[PDB]
Amino acid sequence: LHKEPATLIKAIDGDTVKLMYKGQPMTFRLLLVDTPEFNEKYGPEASAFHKKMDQNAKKIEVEFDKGQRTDKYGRGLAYIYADGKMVNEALVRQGLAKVAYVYKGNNTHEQLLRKAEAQAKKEKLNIWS
């Protein structure tokens, strides 16, 4: 996999964000995770965590996996990095997302993220509290 540039356009929620990619506005949905909807418990906290991470970043990058790059709603599917740190993983490590939606052929970082989820659960963080 490789990292490609993007710039933040706007926060959306815990697991989606509006980015400019190859000069076009797209909504991105984070691979391999599910944050609570803003209406649900820890939704606000997930949104805020995601928003802060991306807005504090100097450099946002997107990394597509081997499979589908857009989902059925036209959202980009990617691992998103904020100054080299993977947002998807950070959400799971903080107990603000579950590993989820692991479809074969776009699951390169599955085991990395499950390792994070296990550490979050052990610490009883947020969703695992």
Ligand X SMILES: Cc1cn([C@H]2C[C@H](OP(=O)(O)O)[C@@H](COP(=O)(O)O)O2)c(=O)[nH]c1=O
Q: List the binding residues for Ca(2+).
A: 15, 34-35
Residue 101 lies near ligand X (rule: CB under 6 A)? yes
Q: Looking at this protein, which amino acid is placed at residue 30?
A: L
Told to judge if 69 belongs to the known catalytic residues of this protein, a careful annotator would answer no
The single residue of 29, 61, 89, 93 carrying the catalytic annotation is 29
CA gap 42, 49 in Å, rounded: 10
Residue 63 lies near ligand X (rule: CB under 6 A)? no
Told to judge if 37 belongs to the known catalytic residues of this protein, a careful annotator would answer yes
Helix (H) or strand (E) holding 39: none
The residues in 6-25 that bind Ca ion, with binding defined as CB under 5 A, are 15
Nearest to 17 by CA among 45, 52, 42: 52
Partner touching 77 among ligand X, Ca ion, none, CB below 5 to 8 Å by kind: ligand X
The single residue of 61, 75, 93, 117 carrying the catalytic annotation is 75
Strand-pairing partners, residue 61, are 5, 81
Told to judge if 114 belongs to the known catalytic residues of this protein, a careful annotator would answer no
Q: How far is the CB of 18 from Ca ion (least distance, A)?
A: 15
Please state the residue numbers annotated as binding site: 15, 34-35
CA gap 127, 95 in Å, rounded: 5
Q: Which two tokens stand for residue 56?
A: 């504090």
CA gap 3, 6 in Å, rounded: 10
Among 22, 58, 72, 104, the residue binding ligand X under the rule CB under 6 A is: 72
C-beta closer to Ca ion: residue 3 or 70: 70
> Where in the sequence numbering do the catalytic residues fall?
29, 37, 75
